[PDB]
Design a binder for this molecule. Structure first.
Ligand code: NA
Ligand SMILES: [Rb+]
Lengths: 30, 21, 28, 22, 30, 28, 22, 21, 28, 22, 30, 21
């Protein structure tokens, strides 16, 4: 797996692969 | 949180999973 | 035929721009 | 009913994505 | 809506959502 | 079944790389 | 005829995207 | 223009719409 | 109908995250 | 057989993408 | 064609257009 | 290689093709 950096929509895009059958929560609040 | 952890520093596979329900 | 998995790749990308500052949950 | 259903089998505007945020 | 920053293809990608039924013009010339 | 909306998401992304410096108009 | 038509219902090379720029 | 406005500074919803015809 | 070209756009994007450091070949 | 086949006509987990790297 | 910069997944995404009927090899090793 | 060439400096069409088989 890609062990560097993952910003913008690609951070959200990766959460769709990693979870997949589970779904993901994305909370950026500081 | 999510952004603090993976966009600022090095992230991982089995813990961006942590964010799965 | 309209695909569950592939279509959802754009839905999560769009919700990133639409919600933005507030956040969002996803469950397929 | 549901974002999955309502945005894959017909197109969605920016106001119905606002129905599904947080 | 996301009130920060929007560069590269994501700037063009957002113009497909925001407009949608209208289309968009993209002119970068300095 | 081939979808008007979803396919167009890659068309606008590709035209960003193909045209590049010059620019492009889109109308669906 | 048209990018919509000609690049969704059959695949498109990098030269026919060059037909539709500005 | 488009890039000057939203990539350099903070952009908005109802004016990247400005770029719609 | 499930499209050879469009589906492959997400496959190459996912292989970028899955393989990552090692690399990958693609042939359609 | 093949990533093309096995990840387009049915969905794929992160472990079968690991079958196709380098 | 876009003669500037092309990083992250977009570098891989462009290799899918440019090659297309050929495929592409992506080797990042320093 | 690939990343050294196009992410660090200006890339081109007919040589990111170089990476096609
Ligand atoms: Na797609
Ligand atoms: Rb990006």
């Amino acid at each position: 797996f890609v062990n560097q950096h993952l910003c913008g929509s690609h951070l959200v895009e990766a959460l769709y692969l990693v979870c997949g059958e589970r779904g993901f929560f994305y909370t950026p609040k500081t | 949180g999510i952004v603090e952890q993976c966009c600022t520093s090095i992230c991982s596979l089995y813990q961006l999973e942590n964010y799965c329900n």
